[PDB]
Amino acid sequence: MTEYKLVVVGACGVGKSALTIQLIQNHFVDEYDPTIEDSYRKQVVIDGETSLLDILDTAGQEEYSAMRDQYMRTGEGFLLVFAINNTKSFEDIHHYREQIKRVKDSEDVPMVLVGNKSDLPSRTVDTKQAQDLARSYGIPFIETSAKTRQGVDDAFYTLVREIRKHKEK
Ligand SMILES: *CCC(=O)N1CCN(c2ncnc3c(F)c(-c4c(O)cccc4F)c(Cl)cc23)CC1
Ligand SMILES: Nc1nc2c(ncn2[C@@H]2O[C@H](COP(=O)(O)OP(=O)(O)O)[C@@H](O)[C@H]2O)c(=O)[nH]1
Ligand SMILES: [Ca+2]
Ligand SMILES: [Ca+2]
Ligand SMILES: [Ca+2]
Ligand SMILES: [Ca+2]
Question: Which residues bind GTP?
């Protein structure tokens, strides 16, 4: 009854593919081709309404392309993924947000900030610092583990709720 294009972004190694493959195939990948980009589909009921999700798992290279702009423009909501043990990945979030804003030609784009790898003890990004970032962006923040599945469905489903909220703006 409604289709949603979701796009998963963030630095290399943060767990984009792991999170996506957990959601879709219900297993954790220890190693997955670091540059392949593909889309996945899945149907989910969220708040009583059937959602047909088309999920783009981004990767590729550190480069601009008009082709990438074109697929990114199709996205209706974005997961901004960092790893909680990788401060550089957190620092990179700003860039991803900016580039989304660019291609969507909009400051108000449905997004969720995702702190992945929450199962690891060696955290270098505080929950508070993320929460404050997400506050400044006006978006939710969810901590996930693709390894244990903690928060995986929540991250994706919260993004759909964000998209729904926006489509009524
Ligand atoms: C390990 C491979 C990997 O996961 N990645 C490769 C580097 N990526 C990446 N690097 C820099 N900038 C990126 C970027 F700006 C976008 C982006 C564009 O170009 C337009 C609109 C919205 C965007 F997020 C993307 Cl998709 C990837 C970028 C990805 C991570
Ligand atoms: N411990 C832990 N490792 C993870 C988690 N998510 C991803 N990884 C690992 O981190 C590495 C990169 O994951 P991947 O999904 O390929 O990252 P991507 O480059 O963002 O697509 C892999 O070794 C994964 O097994 C997580 O939640 N916990
Ligand atoms: Ca990947
Ligand atoms: Ca404009
Ligand atoms: Ca601005
Ligand atoms: Ca908002």
Answer: 10-18, 29-35, 59-60, 116-119
Q: Which among 143, 139, 96 has a CA at the least distance from the CA of 116?
A: 143
CATH number where 138 lies: 3.40.50.300
Q: Is the dihedral of CA 137, 72, 117, 140 positive or negative?
A: positive
Resolution stated for this PDB structure, in Å: 1.4
Q: Which ligand approaches the C-alpha of residue 32 most closely?
A: 2
Chain breaks in the chain (C to N over 2.5 A) after: none
Q: Is 68 in the pocket of ligand 1 (CB under 6 A)?
A: yes
Residue with CA closest to ligand 2 atom 24: 30
What range does the domain containing 133 cover?
A: 1-169
Task: Establish whether residue 69 lines the binding site of ligand 1, counting it when its CB lies within 6 angstroms of any ligand atom.
Answer: yes
